[PDB]
Design a protein around this ligand. Structure first.
Ligand SMILES: [Zn+2]
Ligand SMILES: [Zn+2]
Ligand SMILES: [Zn+2]
Ligand SMILES: [Zn+2]
Ligand SMILES: [Zn+2]
Ligand SMILES: [Zn+2]
Ligand SMILES: [Zn+2]
Lengths: 274, 274, 274, 274, 274, 274, 274
């Protein structure tokens, strides 16, 4: 049989983490990625299942995710190395029948464990499932450079940050009409930041962690990567503009509204009101 | 027979979209590319023609383009993926005998359609054919980073933008002596922005869409990519200069005139007058 | 999504047909391969399913195969080209709910059809399913050189051919204890040769077609390829031995029996009696 | 850290099994290879050591091999697949402190076990260590085609087989002056054939198994592969000669003696006496 | 035998220098890298040892490093070329029994010598061994762009530089809790700058050379590269922020303290006091 | 025979032009490169010499270059494409016996001609030969981004530009102690700019063309590329520092002097006096 | 500089030895190849010359070869490994000014020495130079399978062997009109067999060593390989024909004569007379 490393989901994880590494968004072990799978995706690959799946309890019960398999990045692992040794840096985990924990079916060799931002990932998957009737399947986190830089210079407010990002590239309204939610800075890797993130995920597909990075949700690896890339392109434009002295003209409220109408999208009200 | 994916035109499309992706000009589905072909180019490749070519009406009749085949990028498709799966992201279309619509001869698999900027593309091909006696064959659109940034900070005026870009790199006058036309911001993906672009294309080979990106036209994929790259290199230089406090010296009107004379080119008058 | 061409089953078909081409067993369009799949194998790959699956009736109803998907080689297609263009040379077909025909879900581009030995394949799958309680999943046919040559020189009889092949390599008894069935020469590509082959498949995993080639059955692509390779290695040895004047010593009946006992296998009685 | 698959010994195992596969010596799971290592060779690679090394008792105690690590091919595994998935087909085992068994430190995934010819391998390593003062480190077994064919046609006697192989290529006396030992046919995969092989290994570096294949020993993977290749090239020549009616002239006893003298080698007496 | 160029340590040196080249941190011969090895790492590779190891005296005796082998970059060699010709750009050196000098066992072909920053490297290895009980094995130096830029604009003081870098990316405190030491500018390539660097290395794992670059220490190539990458990512953020007019909000003292507590790290006191 | 495209000089031209393309220094046809060869370099490659070498007169006689072969980039050719089709983008030219013109021995297919900056190249080769006693062999021109940006913001004066570049990276004094000469802006592609450049080349190895790019000279492709890369790295640092408000501390005159003394280099006096 | 391993002559040696390995002509260390070079071929590559060239005396003085460089295969080295590690298996040697010995300028690492058939090689180069006015530059030896087999079955006589090889493929007369000389069997690796071979080389370009192999001479690596390949193809045909009972029809004397006339070649008289 073909090895699981050649599967669509390991190859896709390799693509997204390598692309994110080339972008300069994932120095060291910065970032983490988790993709929800089906039983069908992994069925062909039993030859690669560890004989004695390691069992690890979840920070807190998550019954909506019972029996759900996922492919995740490991704690302390480098995006840069996922293409070099997938099994060492990725893992396939399956949540048990009552949502209390998960088994490591494959990967995470040498006693590696899932990303320390697992709470944030699983709590958000769980909310994005409710918000999109199961259409979303990916949670991606990275240290998007210009988005981080802007958190030191713009008001850390959902409405003002959303409007600025919308202005920084025409497509932004269309790509993220629900805008981007901003949390206050929090200690990372906890249930609290996980919870706050999951909470923001009910209303937005993008969430910013000041002085830290971004979190995105989407139906596929490409759209989630694309979603973050759009927001970061916009941020990149803004960083150049602010470095040139600021906007002397920009996309206006009237134009944002025309844009939402032509693309059949309803823009986040707080950000449009500005 | 060799598969149409190995053809000169699919390979060329792969090169230009991949190069544009590496430049950071085409996040997500940003940008779109269309290349006019001949019957001879696709003659060898009938084995790859779909049995039942899907027929799609053109936004508006375009008789000057009757019976003309093109290779195009798909709507919502990522430049980053063209190299991975050409058929899923590109398509060969042929305009019918009376310019009313086109048939999808190849690609655009899974019910994909041509770029939503098709109007802008076809309308501009149509004008560039008239302006150049058929020499131009490509229309490329991308989210050129520095060019976008400059639309928030320079006067969105054809003459002032052209002069600034000419000053930002000696070769610019030579590469785009007709300068670059700027439109007002418009809702993208419409016949209106298409028309306005095509209109600008009668006088310029480069057209800017504020807060959005650029459009270029040329005889080949390489020259069109080159044309945009030149303009964006200039913009990149300008962004660094404005970030350093502004031009303390620059290419002068006298110099731009000497330059036009040595290269047998007649510089756009409004821009030279400044 | 990853393209179906990167799937385990297309990659496996590529491996087996390329390996068989390198062996010199598949000149021109010689040979054909068919692999039974599950719904799970193809579930991830709907993006690659033709919109209007072509429907083709089965030579004769086969209700035991209802709703079963398979990946097959095309009629007139070259094993050598499967690695170059999988979609042109392979196809994924699914038998309809009542076994009357099948839909072409993917591949077989340019109006190609499944192998003209489809009857032989499907009738044999059907018998091997009954004989092995669904463990067998592959039917492979190739023009194994030395096996063909021996059909002009040895008695075309199941018992004598089985015993000779068993003698030509120690492992043979262990690999094919049920021996190899020989048909009389028949016109290929018919229901009759299909039927005769399927009939032989109830008692053997290997069937020879004099002056033509071999047919093998097994749980996986590798074991079926390996099964044929073993039989052909043996044949290769025999062709050298007969070219040297014949066996001056060989594996005896007593030794074949000891061999069957150590490997817990019960050798075909007719061949052991010789 | 670099993955153990990139190590010198896994790469070497890949090379030798792949080369042997291309030679047509290893159909299916035919052949098996074992290479003795040092602690230093595997020291860098602890990250790849299974957490809970599976323990498997040796057929019989082998104290001379205590604490010795080896890389081996797996039982039922194909030489053809070693390059595709090293861990699935190879394994690193270490003999325990009192030679009673071994631990599987790496590989042999999916519950695979070492080759079923392990007895023959370990017993022979053990004798070749005594015969060469530890210089030999490899034991290779393969289904060398012409060598097999010749066992059906030449007298299965050490002296006559050795002399014929020495005559079949000038270098043979030089490469294997101790000649090649022939056993009677035996049931494979037992302690008995293991013992008999190991016994022959005290006097020869090559041992033939009639109707089966060859076993070779040497200091390195290359020399052992080379040793077998030499013997098989000779056999190939002999097969062509016997197919042409037999030797009409050949290397004479006098010549073989001159040859042994020029290369400072003392030819096996029984074979030279013929 | 496999060539030493395919070893774990040459491959790792290739990866780190190539990655640093792609980052734009090592123009020309900028940067130098040295990795401490064991006897076991190089034992397998004697076939590649020069016959007459060149002997070169150390700037000053270093008995703590006696008999220790290392792989180092050469003086005037380009990181960009390490992947193209490892032996021309790298070397394996072994310090003699009394720390007075070293032998060049491999590489540094065409009379090349170790990096001219060898003092700084060896003195620092020597101090990092004491400070970490031998856990550190790498010293890496590169011209990290943003880190260099910041030395012209921030107070060249350990405490203020450390606090600014900690603020520029949440993970920084966790990755380098001991902070980064800054030296006064010094003439490079001397014992004095080496000494000063080694001295800073007793308290920090990162050391900055104003108007020059950075030096890092760690247990492996990946962590040391990761360590520098983290510091440089933070600097990159700061350069964008200072280019936008400065921090309007940032990570506060209280937050840095909460962060150190959740990750069980004790932050450098001088930098936390600011 | 091996094709000239695999020669050291074509491969080296491919490397330098590809590297410069990845740096973003050579949009479109920006830049040009010329490398002096010997008769020995091209002797093995006569099979690839055009039968009827095209003859082209030199702008002005250059007897010091008589009978000297060179490999050059073509006029209007893209650095990006050199790796894709060397013969279409490069050419081997040999100056005739009296320096009046040259023959195109290889490449420049489809009627291409050497770079339109040929005057500047040949005139500079000619001066660098005199200034270095034939050690220099390369002249490289590129649109180095930050170096261009700085020409709009710093005083276009040899002394002040040299001192600023020296301050922007410690190594700069050591790499280019003769500093960088700046010309006034001139119409490119003429004998006049060629002459002025050649003139500046008597005293410097780096020459800047305001609002245009840089020209470098060196003994090999790697050192010339490295020389420009150093200068451009320094400019990149300066652009970040000026974007942050300017130098608050920098390398002082005293330190530059200590630096020149330790490296046995005599710094350009006008720049040190500032 | 590009490493000598990428040179035309190392690449050509890799090609020929790899091709010969794939042909099955060079088991173990069977065969050896030597190619005459010029000073110009190696001039670019001094960076790769060993500092202390090993000096080795020639078996006997050869003043006609004074100051001549050659690339040779090493003693005991495998053709299979030349592609994997050229320096370990090949060497560049230069004969000293008075033909007494040679220096090893490059390769033959780990104390390897030139092929033990060096006498045969150099003596033959020396004669082929005289016989062809320096046009021949290569001497190749290999264990061509069918040519070896035929030496046990055909009369070992120049005339009869030549005529049989001429009959076995129409082109043979044209490719080797001077026929192939056969020596009596001799102990290999001596001056005597070298001398005898060199002697045969005055009249033929192909020489056979019974029960051993062939030696060929030619102007280039490709023609020498081609020359042997032709002879071996013919032998391969003969071995099949003799295995089928012998020639029932063949190329007649009259036809050989017509053939020599149409190709302006004068066939060896002894072989035509048969
Ligand atoms: Zn993070
Ligand atoms: Zn757009
Ligand atoms: Zn058939
Ligand atoms: Zn066996
Ligand atoms: Zn440095
Ligand atoms: Zn230029
Ligand atoms: Zn030989």
């Amino acid at each position: 049989m073909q090895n699981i490393t050649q599967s669509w989901f390991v190859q896709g994880m390799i693509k997204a983490t390598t692309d994110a590494w080339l972008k300069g968004w994932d120095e060291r072990n910065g970032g983490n990625l988790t993709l929800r799978l089906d039983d069908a995706d992994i069925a062909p690959y039993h030859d690669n299942f560890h004989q004695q799946p390691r069992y690890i309890p979840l920070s807190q019960p998550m019954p909506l995710l019972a029996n759900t398999p996922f492919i995740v990045t490991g704690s302390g692992k480098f995006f840069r190395n996922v293409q070099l040794d997938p099994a060492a840096n990725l893992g396939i985990v399956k949540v048990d029948s009552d949502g209390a924990g998960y088994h490591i079916l494959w990967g995470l060799t040498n006693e590696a464990v899932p990303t320390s931002e697992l709470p944030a990932h699983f709590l958000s998957h769980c909310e994005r499932i409710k918000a999109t009737n199961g259409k979303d399947r990916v949670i991606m986190h990275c240290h998007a450079t210009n988005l981080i830089a802007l958190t030191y210079v713009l008001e850390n407010d959902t409405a003002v940050f959303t409007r600025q990002l919308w202005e920084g590239s025409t497509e932004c309204l269309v790509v993220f009409p629900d805008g981007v939610g901003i949390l206050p800075w929090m200690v990372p890797g906890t249930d609290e930041i996980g919870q706050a993130t999951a909470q923001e995920m009910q209303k937005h597909s993008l969430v910013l962690w000041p002085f830290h990075g971004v979190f995105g949700s989407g139906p596929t690896l490409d759209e989630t990567f694309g979603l973050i890339d759009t927001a970061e392109k916009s941020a990149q434009v803004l960083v150049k503009v602010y470095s040139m002295g600021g906007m002397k003209q920009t996309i206006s409220r009237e134009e944002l509204i025309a844009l939402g109408k032509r693309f059949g999208v309803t823009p986040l009200a707080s950000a449009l009101a500005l």
